[PDB]
Amino acid sequence: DLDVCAREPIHIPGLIQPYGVLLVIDPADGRIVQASTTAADLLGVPMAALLGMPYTQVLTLPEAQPFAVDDQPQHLMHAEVRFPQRATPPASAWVAAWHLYPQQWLVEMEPRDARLLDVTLREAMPLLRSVERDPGIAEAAVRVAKGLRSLIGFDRVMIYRFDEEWNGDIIAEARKPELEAYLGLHYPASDIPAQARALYLRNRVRQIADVGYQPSPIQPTVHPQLGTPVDLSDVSLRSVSPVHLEYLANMGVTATLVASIVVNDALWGLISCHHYSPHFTNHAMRDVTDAVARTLAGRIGALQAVARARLESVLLTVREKLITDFNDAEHMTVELLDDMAPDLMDVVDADGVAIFHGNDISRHGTTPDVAALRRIRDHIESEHDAVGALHVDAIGEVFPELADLAPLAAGFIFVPLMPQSRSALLWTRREQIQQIKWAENPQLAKLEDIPNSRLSPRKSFDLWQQTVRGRARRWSPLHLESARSLRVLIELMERKRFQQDFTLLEASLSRLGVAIIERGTANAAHRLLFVNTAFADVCGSDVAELIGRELQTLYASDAPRANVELLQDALRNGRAAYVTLPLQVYRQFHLEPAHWLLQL
Ligand SMILES: */C=C\C1=C(C)C(=O)N/C1=C\C1=NC(=C\c2[nH]c(/C=C3/NC(=O)C(C=C)=C3C)c(C)c2CCC(=O)O)/C(CCC(=O)O)=C1C
Numbered sequence: 001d002l003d004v005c006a007r008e009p010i011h012i013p014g015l016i017q018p019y020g021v022l023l024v025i026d027p028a029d030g031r032i033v034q035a036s037t038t039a040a041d042l043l044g045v046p047m048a049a050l051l052g053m054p055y056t057q058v059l060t061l062p063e064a065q066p067f068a069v070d071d072q073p074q075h076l077m078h079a080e081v082r083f084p085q086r087a088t089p090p091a092s093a094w095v096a097a098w099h100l101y102p103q104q105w106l107v108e109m110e111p112r113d114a115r116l117l118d119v120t121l122r123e124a125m126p127l128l129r130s131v132e133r134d135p136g137i138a139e140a141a142v143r144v145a146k147g148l149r150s151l152i153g154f155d156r157v158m159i160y161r162f163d164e165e166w167n168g169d170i171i172a173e174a175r176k177p178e179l180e181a182y183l184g185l186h187y188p189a190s191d192i193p194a195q196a197r198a199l200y201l202r203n204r205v206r207q208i209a210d211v212g213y214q215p216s217p218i219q220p221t222v223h224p225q226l227g228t229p230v231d232l233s234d235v236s237l238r239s240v241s242p243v244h245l246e247y248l249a250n251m252g253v254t255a256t257l258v259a260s261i262v263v264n265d266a267l268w269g270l271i272s273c274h275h276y277s278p279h280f281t282n283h284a285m286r287d288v289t290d291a292v293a294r295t296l297a298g299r300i301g302a303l304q305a306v307a308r309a310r311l312e313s314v315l316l317t318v319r320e321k322l323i324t325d326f327n328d329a330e331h332m333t334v335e336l337l338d339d340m341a342p343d344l345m346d347v348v349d350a351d352g353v354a355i356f357h358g359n360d361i362s363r364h365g366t367t368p369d370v371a372a373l374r375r376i377r378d379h380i381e382s383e384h385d386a387v388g389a390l391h392v393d394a395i396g397e398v399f400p401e402l403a404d405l406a407p408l409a410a411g412f413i414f415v416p417l418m419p420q421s422r423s424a425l426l427w428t429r430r431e432q433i434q435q436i437k438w439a440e441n442p443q444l445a446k447l448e449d450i451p452n453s454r455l456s457p458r459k460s461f462d463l464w465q466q467t468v469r470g471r472a473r474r475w476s477p478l479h480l481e482s483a484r485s486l487r488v489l490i491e492l493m494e495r496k497r498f499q500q501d502f503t504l505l506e507a508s509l510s511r512l513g514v515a516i517i518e519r520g521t522a523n524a525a526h527r528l529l530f531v532n533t534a535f536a537d538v539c540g541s542d543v544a545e546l547i548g549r550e551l552q553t554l555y556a557s558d559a560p561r562a563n564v565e566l567l568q569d570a571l572r573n574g575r576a577a578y579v580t581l582p583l584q585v586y587r588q589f590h591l592e593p594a595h596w597l598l599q600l
Contacts, residue, residue, distance in 0.1 A: 005243045006193050012229040015215035015239035017208070019280055020110035022218065022237055023055065024230055027068055027105045030054040033224050036216040036237075042094070042109070044086035047219060055107065058085050061096065066107070069100045075234060076100070078283035081109050095283055099234045104223075106230070108237050114280045119151045124288050127151065131295045140299050141172035144271065148292055149174045152257065152285055154273040158182065159261075159296075161269040164474055165189055166197065167464060168269070179276075180457075184437040184444050187460040188467050196241075200260050201267045202233060204293070205286045208240055208256040210278040211248045215239055236286075247455040248274075255279035257286075259293040263301045271296070315347045315482055319489055319544035326493045329501070333494055334423050338362050347486070348413060348479040350427035358422045367428050368408040376402060377424060380414055385477070387484035390414040394471040403470065406431050411472025413480070415487040418494050425490075427483065429472035433465055489548040492518065492527055500594060505530050508597075513538055513587075517551060517596040519574065525550045526571055529595060538600060540584055551598075555583050567591075 016022050016036045021043075024034035032053050040047045043058045050058065060082035067074070081096035083089070092111040099106040127147040134140035141159035149157045156179055159172035166189035173183035192200075200206055218230050232238035248256065255275035261268045271293055281289070318340050325336045334357045337344070341364035344353050352365030354373045361373050368376075379402055380390060391413045396403030411429035438445055449458035495518065508514050509532060516530040528549050536543045539554070551571070560581040570577035570591060580588040587600040 001243065005241065006190060008193065008195070008241055008243075010193070010195055010241050011199065011231055011233045011238070013215075013232065013239040013241075014218050014221050014229055016218065016232070016235070016237040017210075017239060018213055018216040019209045020108060020237040022109075022230075022235060023107045024218070024223070025055050025066070025105040025107060027066070027100070027103070030056055032058070034218055034220060034230060036218055038216045042086075042090065043083050051220065058083070059096070059107075059109075060084055064098070066098050066100055066105055069102050071102075073099065073101045073234075078110075080112075097236075097283075103226070106235060108235050110237065111280070111282070113282045113284075116153060118282065118284050119288055120284070121288060121291065124151055124292060128291065128295045131292070131299055134299055137300055137303055138171065140296055140303075142174070144292060144296050145172045145174035148271065148273065148289065151292075152273065152281060152289060153275075154257065154279065155179060155276045156274040158272045158274070159269065160272065162267065166192070166194075167468070168192065171269075180447065181441050181443045182447075182457055184441040185447075185457060185461050186432075186436070186464045186468075187457075188464045190463070191460055196244075197267060199233060199238075200258060200270060201262065203236065204260050204290050205236075205281075206256075206258045207236065207281045207286065208248070209280040211240075211245055211254050211256075243455070250450045250453040250456055252276055257281045257289060259289050261293055261297050261300070263297050263304070268297065268300060311347065314343055316542055316544050318343045318347060318486070319548070322486075322489055322493060323544060323547055326496075327505075329497075332357075333490060333497070334417070337425070337490075338364070341365075344425075344486075345427070347482050348427050348475070349429075350413070351430045352408065352428040354426040354428065356417075356422065356424040356426065365428070366408055366430060367426075368405050372405050372409070373426065376405065376409060376412065376426065377414070387480050388415075389480070389484050389487055391475055391480060391483075393474045396470045406470035407434060410470055411475060413475065413483045415483055415490075417487065417490045421494075423494075425487075429475075431470055431472055432468035435473075485548060488527070492529065492548050496529060508532065513600040515598045517591075517598055519594055519596075525552070526596075527551070528554075535600065538583075538585070538587060555581055555589075557582050557584060 018038050021039045022036045023032050023039060025031065026033050032050055032055055035047070035050055037047070039050055043050060045053070045058050061079070063079035064076045066076070076098035078095040078097045081094045092113065094109050095112045096107055096109045099108070131140050131143055134143060145157040145159055148154065156173070156175040158170050160168045161171045162168060168187045168191065170182050170185045173181060175181065222229055253274045254277050257273035259271040261270055321336065321340060325331065326333055334355060337355055341353050345365050350365065352363065352367030354367050355362040356377060361370050363370070363373070367373065379399055392398045393411045395410055395412065396406050408430050409428045410431035413427040414424065416424045436444070447458055447461070450456040453459070505516065508516070508530065512532065513535045514532040515528055515535050518527050518529040520526050528547050531543055531546045533543060536546050539546055563579045563581060566579055567577045574593055576593060577591045590599045
């Protein structure tokens, strides 16, 4: 309640959802040791008589049987269950699922079907086949929400995406026109506790048939000879926290079906179905919903793989241009930087870029004012894994003097392009509040609170807005690396500008393994000043991906060693080392001396 519920043990509630029946069985004699209150009317045997009876006397299993487990628990899927002690058979056919653990057996039973018609895999396959051919995550998510709304009959279907902090974003939505649109709403991580999140990942599909259900207590409560509560981590009939029930009741929601979106074994988000009237989702439709979630997750991870590859090639194109369009000599490395500005932003997913050249500042995306850009660099200057670049995700938390610049520079990446020079580069990101899709849902601004409520979508949207205030989406170590490797390449080219300029590079490029190595002037390290195509072919990396790299980064192969110190003493003094060692494959390293001429 209020705060303590963040660490509520929602897996041992001692209650179940009354639409089904649960039994706890002793795996050696088959005696029922514990049972839900709903077991007495279903099996037709009084609760007192039932507790201490073998399951074979009260229920019949024509299909799969329970078997003793030793190591990993086994879970038998839902199959036909009959009741021999009933005076009359039940109105609906019942189905049973087994959760077999080494010392305990759990049998959860529910009706085979709803008062609705069953949707099969065959009816779902066009949706599945379509989701697989969708061009974007947004298209795929919208298609699912609409699809799952038609297949299963839900009033609302929403797609959530979790951020790194586990905050939720309603990226897609499908609903009855009359319903309030929550698309574009974000909620804080605290709204779904870590155990709730863990169970959704574990369960795959989780339902709430009737929010206003009368909880069915597990009786006797604690195991008669072990004294432990029933762990319902795998039981789908598991009761829901009275906090969540209060949330849904305020909303008018009477049923929910939540399915996991698991991308690369991790929880990416969820599919949440909300009904405004009771809705039992049978085992067959739950299996279909599961198959729909797997397909959407499959597509996301595919579109996320294509996206990485796209970015990697864009990054390599800006590196290729930085080396080739610098060799013009009479063209500033800050001038072509201004032309590349949209690609510069893409490489680190920046909302804007500011190119510094003394007092001259050139803004490109969504960046603060020139006076605010001056303030940022000037405050950084006065302050004077391993990346040679300053970055922040919340400007006011690190530099409270610049706190008022959080709307357009909540997060930034600062790289001085020569610390000797007043030339630099500032990538910016706006605060998370700025990114709210008001356009995609004009009703969001107009979204009002539930009066008399302790919990609501309005309260949750406010809480999130409060938590992410003055903070940008965090910079990935990937995006962080790209910026340091750009600063390395820019400064290397800016050092190449005044350190022995020659036509020898053009003569070395023409001929066939060949690379020029800069000494580095007793600091940072010895880098690849220039490289040839054959050198990149033997290495495996690209000509622009290899220029700027370290000499130690070449033989990133740990296995050789032996020498290393013999190569380092020729680097630390400026002499020659004709020692052969492998790279990424065994090749000969022929170093010859300000700059070294290496070939392999
Ligand atoms: C003490 C912790 C909790 C607070 C605070 C609270 O508000 N709920 C808490 C506990 C649980 N939440 C669970 C699931 C859940 N909650 C939400 C919250 C929302 N924020 C929004 O803006 C909206 C809608 C616009 C909602 C619905 C959400 C999205 C979820 C995921 C499930 C769903 O979408 O229906 C749970 C798990 C309950 C269970 O047993 O299934 C707990 C315990």
